[PDB]
């Protein structure tokens, strides 16, 4: 029926060339078409953003804050309309979709106050007729590549902050649910944003490779899967770009022998089987006793083509010597006696799957978690104070829960030195965003003197 347009240079462009379809499970009846863009259609966006940058960079902080504040209002105005568009192409409870947007709006609210923490200092005559000052400037034109889960919040976690800092933005969202993202872009233009400051270009590997290649774009921001993340990180960084990359991972819970089992089981059941949760896919048990006990409690409660991916995953698991304790064929699946050499540990799988890994010491458990592409959340379940202190000291995961789950609904590993947390307190991890989208400068200035200033010393 309908076709979705690009949002380059402040107007909606219709591309006809390559094209895929947006489906809508549970129906899988294809609802719209999406344009897979060529390098020419991207260069349009790049040129648009490059053009908008100098004006926007010099826009007063308070005016940028102003346009963001109206953007926040226009989102809180059109909530119903947006959430509908999320649930329709991504397929998720409207209550979840609304909770996502509430988060996106928190991101917009944080961005409105970024101009304040960005003012710098001035000193007249730091030396004889020499002024000095320090500034925090935007870097230029930047791009963000967004995933399927969260078409609302992940972009609103990138571009509002980047634009508040005075950059311009090219957003290449997911092909699979791009309508909700584009609506929110348009509302930003409706709030007052100049043309070219935010551009939305639909596409896929071609479109992304375009942005990775373009020498005008100075920073690249990505959240999605680990292979694509490694790609964009390495290939971006090799071309002098700043790259921020979150790639899918697995969060681990540790169970000590003294763990309060009902407490751990409650967390694991909420995390693995029960976006309003924690993500945990591996339970590292210290000692066999606690593992046997955990399994005893888990099993009862787990009774509450495209398919071929999961069957393949499970089948490999059995083949390599894991104990398939509950076979969910998709329902809840439980694997025991899992080792890090197995494919079921290394490969991430869609769906309700928990793996139990048996280990002999806490040191071994911590080394297991630390030695892989560690996630953004981890728990330890224990009554021992010394164990908990040690775990918090030596684990390398940034957020830790002791007998309590964490508000981290998807697991991501963060690449490189430009590190940003997706689910942390915005006020705590916001400065990392600000630093990614800005460059510090220190200027020293002198205007060398003339002896006389007759008209002959100037130009016509």
Active site members: 277
- What is the rounded CA–CA span in Å between residue 159 and residue 221? 10
Interface residues for a second copy in 200-259 (CB under 8 A)? 215, 237, 242, 256-258
- What is the rounded CA–CA span in Å between residue 399 and residue 227? 24
Work out which of 11, 190, 213, 260 binds a second copy, going by CB under 8 A: 260
Work out which of 193, 265, 295, 406 binds a second copy, going by CB under 8 A: 406
3-state class of 215 per DSSP?
coil
Sign of CA dihedral 325, 329, 332, 337: positive
Interface residues for ligand ADP in 201-230 (CB under 6 A)? 204-205, 208, 224-225, 228
Q: What angle do CA 278, 281, 282 make, to 5 degrees?
A: 120
Which uninterrupted H or E stretch holds 354? Answer: strand 353-359
Query: Of 335 and 381, which has the nearer Cβ to a second copy?
Result: 381
Interface residues for a second copy in 269-298 (CB under 8 A)? 286-290
Query: Of 191 and 310, which has the nearer Cβ to ligand ADP?
Result: 310
Does the protein bind a second copy through residue 133 (CB under 8 A)? Answer: yes
Interface residues for ligand ADP in 175-194 (CB under 6 A)? 175
Query: Of 75 and 395, which has the nearer Cβ to a second copy?
Result: 395
Helix 94-112 to helix 61-77 angle (10° resolution) is: 160
* Number of amino acids touching a second copy (CB under 8 A): 106
Please report where in the chains the tokens 């020419």 appear, as a residue.
40
- What is the rounded CA–CA span in Å between residue 136 and residue 434? 10
Interface residues for ligand ADP in 131-150 (CB under 6 A)? 145-148
Work out which of 44, 107, 174, 438 binds ligand ADP, going by CB under 6 A: 174
Question: What are the residues whose beta carbons fall under 8 Å from the beta carbon of 253, sequence distance 6 or more?
Answer: 264, 267, 268, 271, 280, 282, 283, 284, 378, 379, 380, 381
* Number of amino acids touching ligand ADP (CB under 6 A): 13
Does the protein bind a second copy through residue 422 (CB under 8 A)? Answer: yes
Does the protein bind a second copy through residue 59 (CB under 8 A)? Answer: yes
Question: Minimum distance between the CB of residue 242 and ligand ADP, rounded to whole angstroms?
Answer: 18
205 binds, among ligand ADP, a second copy, none (CB under 5 to 8 A by kind): ligand ADP
DSSP state of 273: I
173 — phi, psi (to 5°)? -80, -175
Which uninterrupted H or E stretch holds 284? Answer: strand 282-286
Question: Minimum distance between the CB of residue 411 and ligand ADP, rounded to whole angstroms?
Answer: 12
Residue-wise burial string across 109-142, b where 16 or more C-beta atoms lie within 10 A, e elsewhere: ebbbebbeebeeeeeeeeeeeeebeeebebbbbb
End-to-end CA distance of the chain: 62
Work out which of 48, 195, 399, 451 binds a second copy, going by CB under 8 A: 399
- Between 354 and 383, how does the x/- string for binding to a second copy read (CB under 8 A)? ------xxxx-------x----------xx
Question: Minimum distance between the CB of residue 451 and a second copy, rounded to whole angstroms?
Answer: 11
Interface residues for a second copy in 74-113 (CB under 8 A)? none
Residues that bind ligand ADP (CB under 6 A): 145-148, 174-175, 204-205, 208, 224-225, 228, 231
């Amino acid at each position: 029926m309908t076709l979705i347009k690009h949002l380059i240079g402040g107007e909606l462009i219709a591309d006809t060339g390559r094209t895929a379809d947006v489906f809508n499970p549970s129906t899988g009846e294809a609802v719209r078409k999406v344009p897979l863009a060529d390098r020419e259609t991207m260069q349009q966006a790049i040129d648009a953003a490059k053009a908008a940058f100098p004006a926007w960079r010099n826009t007063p902080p308070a005016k940028r804050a102003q346009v963001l504040f109206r953007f926040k209002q226009l989102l809180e105005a059109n909530e119903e309309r947006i959430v509908k568009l999320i649930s329709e192409e991504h397929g998720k409870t409207i209550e979840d979709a609304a909770g996502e947007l509430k988060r996106g709006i928190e991101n917009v609210e944080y961005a409105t106050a970024a101009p304040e923490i960005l003012k710098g200092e001035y000193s007249r005559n730091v030396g004889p007729n020499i002024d000095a000052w320090s500034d925090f400037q935007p870097i230029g034109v930047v791009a963000g590549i967004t995933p399927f889960n969260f078409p609302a919040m992940v972009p609103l976690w990138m571009y509002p902050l980047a634009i508040a800092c005075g950059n311009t933005f090219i957003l290449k969202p997911s092909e699979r649910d791009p309508s909700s993202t584009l609506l929110i872009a348009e509302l930003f233009h409706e709030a007052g944003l100049p043309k070219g400051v935010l551009n939305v270009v639909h596409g896929d590997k071609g479109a992304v490779d375009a942005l990775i290649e373009a020498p005008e774009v100075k920073a690249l921001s990505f959240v999605g899967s680990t292979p694509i993340a490694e790609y964009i990180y390495s290939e971006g960084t090799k071309r002098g770009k700043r790259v921020q990359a979150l790639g899918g991972a697995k969060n681990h819970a540790v169970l000590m022998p003294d763990a309060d089992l009902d407490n751990a089981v409650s967390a694991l059941m909420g995390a693995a089987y029960g976006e309003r949760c924690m993500a945990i896919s591996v339970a590292v048990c210290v000692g066999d006793q606690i593992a046997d006990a955990l399994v005893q409690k888990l099993v009862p409660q787990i009774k509450g083509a495209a398919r071929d991916k999961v069957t393949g995953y499970i089948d490999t698991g059995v083949a390599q010597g894991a104990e398939l304790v509950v076979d969910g064929r998709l329902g809840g699946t439980l694997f025991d006696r899992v080792t890090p050499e197995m494919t079921i540990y290394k490969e991430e799988i869609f769906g309700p799957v928990l793996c139990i890994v048996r280990v002999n010491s806490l040191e071994e458990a911590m080394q297991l978690i630390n030695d892989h592409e560690y996630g953004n959340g981890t728990c330890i379940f224990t009554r021992d104070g010394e164990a908990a202190r040690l775990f918090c000291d030596e684990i390398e995961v940034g957020m830790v829960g002791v007998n309590v789950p964490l508000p981290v609904p998807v697991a991501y590993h963060s690449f490189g030195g430009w590190k940003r947390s997706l689910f942390g307190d915005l006020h705590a991890y916001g400065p990392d965003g600000v630093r990614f989208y800005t460059k510090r400068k220190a200027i020293t200035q002198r205007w060398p003197q003339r002896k006389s200033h007759e008209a002959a010393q100037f130009a016509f």
